[PDB]
Design a binder for this molecule. Structure first.
Ligand code: CA
Length: 555
């Protein structure tokens, strides 16, 4: 049989904004645990939680100070162990983020490492002499300025690809690799059965740290993904850890050229099981990271197609339209205006749950939650907005009003407003004051209202998940885009063991007539949204309502 993870439906929880149970305004482990019956009822097989480890939280929990302790704001280790027991009781699995390109500078390894040149933790990180009166080389940081930080205690510089407070761990040191492997087993032995390796392509560093060439400086992210031992280390990690568990592993791959994605995920290479890439979610983002660029459905489907193709015969992809760093799915890819929000949210659900790959639903997209109506730059928590203000408004490149208009559409805070449970105060997310304001549309868009209504976005997601579970072609089947050039209607087949299904989704808010491939005919309709009647058996065409979606078995 195919691995369990190829047919699983995953749900991403950003615990900080999911459910608060102690009134401090911050979502927590007990809140997630209390909502497992809700997620099980939706049909979820596995939940991916964002970083849940002890952290000073200078970088949203991706700066970890103790890999074997939990994030204090979310609760205690006993709360975590309860969560695991409650998932097991429900036959559900947990995936966690694994952030082992770097630790917090408050991690005890780094406090030990930095204290002297001669200690058993010195080589857990990268310490180098400077050169010509400054840094060891010209490496830039993803977060701006040099990737090298001098430490007066020893006079040497340490490497940080990301923030200054996120020193890179030294995978060239076998003792460090072994520490990391033992740490992973600590979580796997608690029952965790998924791990998502963040910034996985940067783990291997270039021997000798030579300067980047001028061409490389123009895309340093690509250069940092070309360490010569990268795949050797992932193969070692697979042998030492993952050969001994049924867990799924996923790589968060960026910076690298598309054609290297298969090196991480081809099953024959015994590295990782599946890929997270960002080609689709960033497909309409400008280079400045705050504007958008016009795109059509032809761009959307061609981007899906090239990533599906690169996984090919032996690799496997994840599929998502939303996560904790990006604007809301219905706002970004659908149409969130009142006439179209529900219709287009349902259409995007049909896409999500019929793509080839393992789908991840981001918390709240099953309700058709939308972007937040920011009115002032003061309404953003998003640290990135402050940086755009300095880089673009203070420099005179853009006005504060231009920034607000555009970052309202792209900001990660759109995905971080609290989950809208019901129409009580703060949508039932908290009895206190939420850490980030709830979208005022919660009075209309909330789980309580949607779970009781067979016509809701929630109910449609639930129904799709049930259909996907009972139809092997919709998870593990082949995929074929019928016309990558078509910018109105997304139509494609999924096929397995002689059974072929056709998915047809109108991306226009206008009626469209869709003609099937010549010789193809509808046999059965599995489900539709925004349609007043299924086609007749034998149909060779469809008349589509605005934003209609459907899944059909063909003859
Ligand atoms: Ca709380």
């Amino acid at each position: 049989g195919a691995p369990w993870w190829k047919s699983a439906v995953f749900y991403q929880v950003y615990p900080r904004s999911f459910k608060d149970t102690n009134g401090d305004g911050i979502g927590d482990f007990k809140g997630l645990t209390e909502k497992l019956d809700y997620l099980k009822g939706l049909g979820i097989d596995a939940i991916w939680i964002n970083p849940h480890y002890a952290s000073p939280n200078t970088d949203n929990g991706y700066d970890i100070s103790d890999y074997r302790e939990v994030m204090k704001e979310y609760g205690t280790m006993e709360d975590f162990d309860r969560l695991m027991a409650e998932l097991k009781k429900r036959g559900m699995r947990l995936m966690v983020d694994v952030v082992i390109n770097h630790s917090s500078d408050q991690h005890e390894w780094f406090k030990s490492s930095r204290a002297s040149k001669d200690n058993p933790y010195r080589d857990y990180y990268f310490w180098r002499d400077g050169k010509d009166g400054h840094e060891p080389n010209n490496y830039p940081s993803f977060f701006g300025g040099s990737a090298w930080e001098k430490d007066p205690v020893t006079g040497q510089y340490y490497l940080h690809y990301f923030g200054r407070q996120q020193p890179d761990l030294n995978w060239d040191t076998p003792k460090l690799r072994e520490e990391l492997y033992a740490m992973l087993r600590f979580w796997l032995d608690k029952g965790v059965s998924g791990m998502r390796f963040d910034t996985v392509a940067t783990y291997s560093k270039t021997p000798g740290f030579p300067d980047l060439t001028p061409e490389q400086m123009k895309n340093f992210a690509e250069a940092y993904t070309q360490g010569p031992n990268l795949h050797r280390y992932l193969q070692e990690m697979h042998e030492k850890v993952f050969d001994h568990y049924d867990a799924v592993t996923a790589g968060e791959i960026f910076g690298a050229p598309l054609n290297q994605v298969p090196l991480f995920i081809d099953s024959r290479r015994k590295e990782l099981d599946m890929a997270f890439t960002f080609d689709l979610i960033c497909y309409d983002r400008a280079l400045d990271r705050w504007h958008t660029i016009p795109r059509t459905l032809a761009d959307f489907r061609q981007t899906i197609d090239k990533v599906d193709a690169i996984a090919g015969e032996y690799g496997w992809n994840t599929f998502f339209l939303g996560n904790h760093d990006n604007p809301r799915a219905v706002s970004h890819f659908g149409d969130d205006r009142p006439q179209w929000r529900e219709a287009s949210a349902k259409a995007l659900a049909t896409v999500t749950l019929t793509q080839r790959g393992t789908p991840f639903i981001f918390q709240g997209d099953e309700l058709g939650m939308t972007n937040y109506p920011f009115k002032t730059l003061q309404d953003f928590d998003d640290i990135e907005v402050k940086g755009f203000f300095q880089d673009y408004v203070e420099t005179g490149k853009a006005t504060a009003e231009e920034l607000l208009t555009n970052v309202a559409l792209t900001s990660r805070d759109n995905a971080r407003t609290p989950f809208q449970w019901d129409d009580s105060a703060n949508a039932g997310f908290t009895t206190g004051k939420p850490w980030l304001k709830v979208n005022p549309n919660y009075t209309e868009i909330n789980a309580a209202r949607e779970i009781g209504d067979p016509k809701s976005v929630y109910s449609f997601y639930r129904n799709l998940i049930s259909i996907r579970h009972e139809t092997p072609a919709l998870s593990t089947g082949s995929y074929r885009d019928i016309d990558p050039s078509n910018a109105d209607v997304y139509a494609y087949t999924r096929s397995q063991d002689g059974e072929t299904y056709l998915v047809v989704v109108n991306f226009k808010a206008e009626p469209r007539s869709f003609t099937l491939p010549d010789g193809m005919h509808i046999a059965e309709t599995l489900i539709e949204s925004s349609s007043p009647a299924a086609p007749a058996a034998g149909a060779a065409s469809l008349e589509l309502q605005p934003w209609q979606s459907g899944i059909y078995k063909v003859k």
